[PDB]
């Protein structure tokens, strides 16, 4: 929740250290409610599951490079949630 | 579409220069805000019991209904929230 907002505050003012021009304006919030579709959810979960066994919490850089070997370019912030969420409705064990 | 340039035209109209890094956190902040079940409940209640079925439910008449229960401004996320709860029912909307 206050991790969320730090990470997609912390990419708005890494990305724009200076305003966000209006020429971005549809640009920043398509990219806010970007999401993977469920078979990009499922083909994530299945990936990490089949190269983990728990001992290891699944941490967010262990989902953002699932995701991003899927979707070939970096992962959101909403993104890495829907497969932590994922992850969670099967009682996998995550870091965060 | 709609949905989006909606959100669109608030952004351009709120900020016609640029976000200023100062307002990066309210943005974000107001743009995640959203209803709770119960608060959306309350708001489709409100509307089904000032509305006959037939006139279309406007952005306008759900922002009022959101507003009495909130009691700040309406974001078009929680506005949308009690137009697809109204959708469920049947209730026409305007959009």
């Known amino acids: 929740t206050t991790t969320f907002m730090?990470?997609?505050?912390?990419?708005?003012?890494?990305?724009?250290?200076?305003?966000?021009?209006?020429?971005?304006?549809?640009?920043?919030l398509a990219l806010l409610k970007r999401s993977l579709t469920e078979d990009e959810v499922v083909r994530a979960?299945?990936?990490?599951?089949?190269?983990?066994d728990g001992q290891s919490p699944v941490?967010?850089?262990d989902i953002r490079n699932a995701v991003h070997q899927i979707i070939e370019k970096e992962p959101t912030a909403e993104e890495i949630n829907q497969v932590a969420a994922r992850l969670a409705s099967v009682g996998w064990p995550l870091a965060v």
């Open 45 to 52: 979960a299945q990936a990490i599951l089949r190269s983990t």
């Open 6 to 28: 730090d990470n997609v505050l912390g990419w708005l003012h890494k990305g724009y250290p200076e305003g966000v021009p209006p020429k971005d304006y549809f640009a920043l």
């Open 59 to 61: 941490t967010d850089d």
